[PDB]
Amino acid sequence: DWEIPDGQITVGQRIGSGSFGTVYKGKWHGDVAVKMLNVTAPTPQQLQAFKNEVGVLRKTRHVNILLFMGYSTKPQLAIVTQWCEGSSLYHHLHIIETKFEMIKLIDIARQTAQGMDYLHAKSIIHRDLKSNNIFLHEDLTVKIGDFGLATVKSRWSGSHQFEQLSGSILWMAPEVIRMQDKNPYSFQSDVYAFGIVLYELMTGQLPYSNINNRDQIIAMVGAGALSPDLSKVRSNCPKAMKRLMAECLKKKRDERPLFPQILASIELLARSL
Numbered sequence: 001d002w003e004i005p006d007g008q009i010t011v012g013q014r015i016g017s018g019s020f021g022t023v024y025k026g027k028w029h030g031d032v033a034v035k036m037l038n039v040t041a042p043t044p045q046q047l048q049a050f051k052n053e054v055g056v057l058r059k060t061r062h063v064n065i066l067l068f069m070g071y072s073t074k075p076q077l078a079i080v081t082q083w084c085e086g087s088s089l090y091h092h093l094h095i096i097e098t099k100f101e102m103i104k105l106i107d108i109a110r111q112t113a114q115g116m117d118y119l120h121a122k123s124i125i126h127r128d129l130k131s132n133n134i135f136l137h138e139d140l141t142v143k144i145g146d147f148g149l150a151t152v153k154s155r156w157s158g159s160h161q162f163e164q165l166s167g168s169i170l171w172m173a174p175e176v177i178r179m180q181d182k183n184p185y186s187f188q189s190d191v192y193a194f195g196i197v198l199y200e201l202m203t204g205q206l207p208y209s210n211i212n213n214r215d216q217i218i219a220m221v222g223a224g225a226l227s228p229d230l231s232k233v234r235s236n237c238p239k240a241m242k243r244l245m246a247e248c249l250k251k252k253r254d255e256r257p258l259f260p261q262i263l264a265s266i267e268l269l270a271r272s273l
């Protein structure tokens with residue numbers, strides 16, 4: 001069973017407190033990450049819902065997916081994963097401004113597509129792909145996290161949905177902003193978020209960095225009147241990668257490619273470097 005009994009995890013350094021929980025470094029058969037959920041004590045029905053969502057996590061066994069290791073309840077709800085040695089892509093790109101060579105940028109994109117292709121092959125929609133939950137383990141291996149607990153994060157009363165929106169807006173497909181079309185969360189909305197990660201890798205920037213006001217971003221992207229400025233792509237970005245990024249970012253979701261195609265395009269342009 002995957003529940004870790006209380007008393008076994010030792011909590012260490014606080015890594016950061018986001019919209020939905022706080023991550024600590026921990027000790028449990030070695031280094032681990034422990035994400036304490038920022039939520040009210042669950043009801044019996046909610047506790048079962050939480051365990052059912054852990055069922056989704058358990059479907060993932062792939063080197064580009066952050067390794068689920070266990071969960072806690074009786075201290076308070078928590079998800080335990082491996083500890084990644086290194087930083088998130090957000091930290092590299094936008095905080096410490098690591099200067100990756102293009103070959104490495106493409107390899108990070110390739111591994112991220114590899115993990116997303118695996119998730120979609122297991123019928124998992126990520127729903128919140130973004131660079132601060134893509135980790136570069138040992139500066140080599142991409143690990144994708146923060147897809148766990150979909151109903152917990154989006155449906156439970158008091159799950160900080162307003163703060164989650166602020167933290168996700170830059171990666172959010174126009175139809176997820178509006179929530180009006182049928183099944184707004186889809187493989188294709190994950191593709192759009194991945195296109196924004198491609199924009200981050202290939203420009204070094206967050207999209208819309210000339211628009212100070214998140215409130216204009218949400219309205220203008222949701223109305224179909226704003227999209228990332230691909231003229232910011234670096235001069236050494238392969239044309240085929242710029243073309244792929246534009247496809248993933250299409251406003252009309254039915255026009256975006258899915259990850260087998262994305263992965264194949266990236267593998268091809270990586271050989272052609």
Ligand SMILES: Cn1cnc2ccc(Nc3c(F)ccc(NS(=O)(=O)N4CC(F)C4)c3Cl)c(Cl)c2c1=O
Pocket residue numbers: 015023024033034035057060065066067068079080081082083084085086087088133135144145146147148149
């Ligand atoms: C520097 N450093 C190093 N190692 C880290 C490891 C994990 C996390 N965060 C984190 C978490 F602690 C638990 C669950 C998830 N996501 S998850 O529930 O979907 N998870 C994927 C499994 F399948 C279940 C995530 Cl992302 C961070 Cl933040 C760091 C970090 O900052």
